[PDB]
């Protein structure tokens, strides 16, 4: 009977940096996905392996909602099969992804005068991330052999004067898992 609390996800007062991306577990509730699909406030709403209309007809055992901020250039990396700084080193979708990727421009909230530095991404890692892996370490990366050593995170520095490719976007990734277990999230 409880309605799925998507507002705590899409309307949260803080979003995570992408290297420390947040995961919300959604359970034991009814979700109307069309309410979101038809708001017209989303510059991205791309569903993989399912249609958003059919999604209100379906039940799942859990729904995961992963959210973070990236720059607009990098929204295309939040998709099955992609490479890049974000896909390889921050947030990686499986090639078989069944879910939806929702994004919107947040320049009026996430930039600030002189730059907003709170949002970081990982620039260097020893290997690519596995799907849905998270790395929050702050170890100095070695590109060489001395104890050519770099701090592994870089700030986005969001500026209100940037063009759209460099403006901040809030992203929400909905994963629908279907397991041989009781389903708890239905439309």
């Amino acid at each position, epitope marked *: 009977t409880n309605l799925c609390p998507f507002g705590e996800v899409f309307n949260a*007062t803080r979003f995570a940096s992408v290297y420390a991306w947040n995961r919300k577990r959604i359970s034991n509730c009814v979700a109307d996905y069309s309410v979101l699909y038809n708001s017209a406030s989303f510059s991205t709403f791309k569903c993989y392996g399912v249609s958003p209309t059919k999604l209100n007809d379906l039940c799942f055992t859990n729904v995961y909602a992963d959210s973070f901020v990236i720059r607009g250039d990098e929204v295309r990396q939040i998709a099955p099969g992609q490479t890049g700084n974000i896909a390889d080193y921050n947030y990686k979708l499986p090639d078989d992804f069944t879910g939806c990727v929702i994004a919107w421009n947040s*320049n*009026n909230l996430d930039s*600030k*005068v002189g730059g907003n530095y709170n949002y970081l991404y990982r620039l260097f890692r020893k290997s690519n991330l596995k799907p849905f892996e998270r790395d929050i370490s702050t170890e100095i990366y070695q590109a060489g052999s001395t104890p050519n050593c770099y701090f592994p995170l870089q700030s986005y520095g969001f*500026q209100p004067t*940037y063009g*759209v490719g460099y403006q901040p976007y809030r992203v929400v990734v909905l994963s629908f898992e279907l397991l041989h277990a009781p389903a708890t999230v239905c439309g």
Partner: antibody
Amino acid sequence: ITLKESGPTLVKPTQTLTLTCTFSGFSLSTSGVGVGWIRQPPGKALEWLALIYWDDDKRYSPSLKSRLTITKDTSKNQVVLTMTNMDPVDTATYYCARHRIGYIFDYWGQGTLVTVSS
Amino acid sequence: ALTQPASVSGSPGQSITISCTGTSSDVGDFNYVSWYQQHPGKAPKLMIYDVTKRPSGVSNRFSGSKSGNTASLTISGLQAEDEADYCCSSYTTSSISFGGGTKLTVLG
């Protein structure tokens, strides 16, 4: 809904200005909100001075940065500006106002006249 | 950083425009422009924000637009009541910028 600077103040040259903004109707803890300080010298242009965000990020005029400080106290709903080595060219009305990026500044205070003179 | 004409003049009933030019190296894509009205000895009042939007309670006679690095405040159906100085505001990569006023004189 409201912002109000502290009272009009005479300031001796080389000494330091201190102003306090007291606001009501909104919290400086809510995301995206800031409170900034802007001045207008008699017959001259508005000049942005300083800004403080909900998360305590601080930003200043690049040319005046070494003389400025801004502080917030969300419990007292007040924001405090300090400026040093005051000179008669700094005689101006001093305004506080609410910031949110999308609109730059919406609600302004009435302004308070600061006079630098021996 | 922001440059405005010192004065503009319009006759009652007609429409007038005040232009606001930002240096290309300072304002980037020039995304957020606000317009303020200030009456003598009084605080600025927000008339247009985000280039084109009106706060509630501002009359539809005030409108804002942009083209390249020049934003424009347009006032239609000029009334004597709206003589004032009109000031634009925008961002640079380091600060908030204003540039000088435009005194609007309603003629006749």
